[PDB]
Amino acid sequence: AESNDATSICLESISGTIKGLQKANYVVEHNPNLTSEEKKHLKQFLVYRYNPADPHDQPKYVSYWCDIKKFPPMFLDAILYIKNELDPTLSIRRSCREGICGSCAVNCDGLHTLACISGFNRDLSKPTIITPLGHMFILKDLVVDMTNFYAQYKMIEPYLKRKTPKPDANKEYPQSPEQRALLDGLYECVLCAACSTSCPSYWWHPDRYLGPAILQQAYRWIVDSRDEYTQERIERIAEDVRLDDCQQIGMCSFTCPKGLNPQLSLKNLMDMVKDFRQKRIEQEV
Ligand X SMILES: CCCCCCCCCCCCCCCCCC(=O)OC[C@H](COP(=O)([O-])OCC[N+](C)(C)C)OC(=O)CCCCCCCCCCCCCCCCC
What residues are designated binding site? 95-97, 100-104, 116, 189, 192, 195, 199, 222, 224, 227, 230, 246-252, 256
Which residue positions form the known binding site for [2Fe-2S] cluster? 95-97, 100-104, 116
Residue 219's alpha-carbon distances to 25, 55, 59, 155, 245, in angstroms, are: 40, 44, 39, 13, 16
Examine residue 258 and tell whether it contacts ligand FES (CB under 6 A).
no
With CB under 6 A as the contact rule, the residue among 252, 260, 269, 272 that binds ligand F3S is 252
- Burial string for 57-95 (b: 16+ CB within 10 Å, else e) reads eeeebbbbbbebeebeebbbbbbbbbbeebeeebebebe
Burial class (CB in 10 A: 0-12, 13-18, 19+), 37: exposed
* Residue 204 contacts which entry, ligand X, ligand SF4, ligand F3S, none (Cβ below 5-8 A, type-dependent): ligand X
Examine residue 118 and tell whether it contacts ligand SF4 (CB under 6 A).
no
3-state helix, strand and coil shares in percent for the chain, rounded to the nearest 5 = 35, 10, 50
- What x/- string results for residues 14 through 53 when contact with another protein is judged by CB under 8 A? x-xx-xxx-xxxx---------------------x---xx
Separation between Cα atoms, residue 265 and residue 271, nearest integer Å: 10
Residue 246's alpha-carbon distances to 199, 222, 257, in angstroms, are: 9, 18, 20
* Cβ(226)–Cβ(175) below 8 Å: yes
- What x/- string results for residues 140 through 179 when contact with ligand F3S is judged by CB under 6 A? ----------------------------------------
Which residue positions form the known binding site for [3Fe-4S] cluster? 199, 246-252
- What x/- string results for residues 91 through 110 when contact with ligand FES is judged by CB under 6 A? ---xxxx-xxxxxx------
With CB under 6 A as the contact rule, the residue among 68, 146, 260, 269 that binds ligand SF4 is 260
Burial class (CB in 10 A: 0-12, 13-18, 19+), 141: buried
- Choices 17-25, 178-186, 258-266, 274-282; region in contact with ligand SF4 by CB under 6 A: 258-266
Identity of the residue, 173 or 204, whose beta carbon is nearer to ligand X in the bound complex: 204
Identify the bridge partners of residue 106 per DSSP, sorted by sequence position: 113
With CB under 8 A as the contact rule, the residue among 10, 34, 160, 181 that binds another protein is 10
What is the rounded radius of gyration, in angstroms, for the C-alpha atoms of the chain? 24
Least separation, in Å, of the C-beta of 208 and ligand X?
10
Q: Which residues bind ligand SF4 (CB under 6 A)?
A: 102, 189-195, 213, 216, 256, 258, 260, 262
